[PDB]
Amino acid sequence: VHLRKSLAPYWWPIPRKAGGVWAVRPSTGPHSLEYSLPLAVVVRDVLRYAKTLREARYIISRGYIKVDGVVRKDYKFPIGLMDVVEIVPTGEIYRVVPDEAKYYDLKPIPSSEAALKPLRVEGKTAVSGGRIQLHFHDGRNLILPPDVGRQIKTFDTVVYDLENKAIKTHLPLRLGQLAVVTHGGNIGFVGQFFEVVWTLKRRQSVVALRKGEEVRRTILDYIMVIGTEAPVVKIS
Amino acid sequence: GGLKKPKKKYLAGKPKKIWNKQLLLEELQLMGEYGLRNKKELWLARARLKWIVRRARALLSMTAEERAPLEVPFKEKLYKMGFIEDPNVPLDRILSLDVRAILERRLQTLVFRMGLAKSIHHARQLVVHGHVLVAGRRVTSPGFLVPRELEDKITIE
C-alpha cells in the first residue's frame, strides 16, 4: 500500500511539493491515519536524527526508540495524541501533545510522568463474564469488573498506568474542569469548561472553553479533560 | 482538468497598442536613458509599477480596520526597496508613483549613477563580465533591483 505525498495529512511537518512523490504510510497501529505520524517521519523530520529513510529505518531497527514503554522496531508505527516517545541511548522523553502551531508536538517531559498516559474514554462494551471493556481515544482497551466500569462514562479521561495496566486516576467530564482541545481549528487551546449546549447527539454537543477571557468553542468530541485548575501531567 | 503553467510576468506593463507615435517616443526615451536591452525589460519594470499602484489602490478601497494592519507595513516595504522616499506618506500619494523610480533600482543604473563606470552601457558590461561585487559577492544580473540597504555595498572587483 502506497501513500502519495499529495494525499498525506496536511499538518505533517514535511514539504508538500519538494521531495519524492511518496510518503511513508503508517501501518494501522494504535491511532488514526489522519491523526497519526509514522515513526520514520518523527526520527527524520521532527527530531532530525536521520538524514535519509534508510538511516531512519536503521535507528528504529536497533530498538533505540521506545513508544509507551514498548520498543517499536517498525518504521511505519503510528504515533498520535498523548503518546510517550522515549529515546533509549539519549534518555530524552517526549509526549506528543496538541500544539497551537504544529498541530501535534513533541514536548519534553520529566521521567516521573513517562509511564503515565492520559486516555479519553471513547466507549465501553460488555464482554464475556459480565465484565466491562473500555475503549480509549487511541483504540486501546481495558477490561474491568461491571461495578467499577459502571461509574466511568464516555468522554471521561482516565490516567492510565502503562507499567501496571491500571487506572491511576479517573477524571469525569463535568462542567468546570480543565480541558485541552485535541482536534479541529481550535487545537492546542487549554481552558476551563464552562458552557455546553447539549444536542441530541452527545458527541456533537457545543462546548466552550475559557482562559480569562479568551473563549473558544468546539464540539464535545474534540476536547479531552486534563483535570481541575492544575493539569495532571505536563502537556504544554 | 486544467494544469497550471507559468505565464509572462511583464504582460501587465505591456501596451495593447504598440503602434502609437507618442507611445513609441516615450518608451524610446526610457530605453536610451537606462540602456535596456529590449521592450520586455521596460515592460517588466512597468509590471512591477502596476503591482505597487494596484496594491495601493486596493488598500485604499479596504475598510479602515482592514487597512490598518497592512497600511504601514506596505509603505515600509516600499521604502526599503528604494522606490519611495518617505515611508510615512498618505496612501493616496503612492498612487502617483512613476515608473522611473523602479528603473533607478536596477543594478546597472546604480553602477552608472555611482560614477563607477564610463557609460550606462559600460556599466551594464561591468555587471555582465562580473566586476561588480554586492557586499563581496559577484552579482552579474544587470536588471537586479537593489534594495536600499544593499546600495552602499556596491563595489567594483
Binding site: 462542567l175 468546570g176 476551563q192 469548561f193 464552562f194 458552557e195 455546553v196 449546549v197 447539549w198 444536542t199 441530541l200 447527539k201 | -
Partner: protein, 144 residues
C-alpha cells in the same frame, strides 16, 4: 393489525390488540415527534416494530396515496443561480413508506426519516404528520 385509540399513548406504553398481542410504543430517538394515535403490528414499523431510523428528517407533502403501505410525497427547496442572482424553486418526488398506524391524505405535510432500504425506491418512512411535532430546545448549562 391496526387498532385505533381514543387517546394517544406515550413512549413505552404497551397496548394489546383484539388478537391479544401486546405492542409497546418504542422510542425512536426523536423527542419532538409524538407517537401515532393508533397501533400497528408491522415489524417494519418504526413505532411498533424493529425498524431503526437515522437522525435525518425531512418535511414533505403527500401527493399520491394509492400504493400499499407507501405514498408519493414531494420535496421542495430553493436554488440560487449566481449568474442572475435570483432563486429557483425546485421540487422532487420521493417514494416513502406509510405505516398502518399513520393515516395520510394528499396535500398533507408529514415527516419522513431515512432508514435502510425497504424496496427498490423506498428508503424513507413517514415518522408522523406535521401536527404531531412538538417544540424542542437543547440544554444550555453555564458556569457563572
Amino acid at each position: 393489525t391496526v387498532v385505533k385509540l381514543q387517546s394517544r399513548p406515550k413512549v413505552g406504553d404497551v397496548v394489546t390488540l383484539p388478537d391479544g398481542k401486546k405492542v409497546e410504543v418504542k422510542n425512536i430517538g426523536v423527542p419532538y415527534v409524538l407517537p401515532p394515535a393508533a397501533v400497528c403490528d408491522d415489524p417494519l414499523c418504526p413505532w411498533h416494530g424493529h425498524l431503526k431510523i437515522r437522525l435525518k428528517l425531512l418535511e414533505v407533502t403527500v401527493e399520491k396515496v394509492r400504493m400499499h403501505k407507501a405514498a408519493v410525497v414531494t420535496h421542495e427547496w430553493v436554488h440560487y443561480l449566481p449568474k442572475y442572482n435570483r432563486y429557483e424553486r425546485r421540487r422532487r418526488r420521493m417514494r416513502v413508506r406509510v405505516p398502518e398506524c399513520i393515516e395520510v391524505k394528499p396535500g398533507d405535510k408529514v415527516i419522513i426519516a431515512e432508514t435502510r432500504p425497504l424496496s427498490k425506491t423506498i428508503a424513507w418512512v413517514v415518522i408522523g404528520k406535521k401536527e404531531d411535532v412538538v417544540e424542542w430546545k437543547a440544554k444550555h448549562e453555564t458556569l457563572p
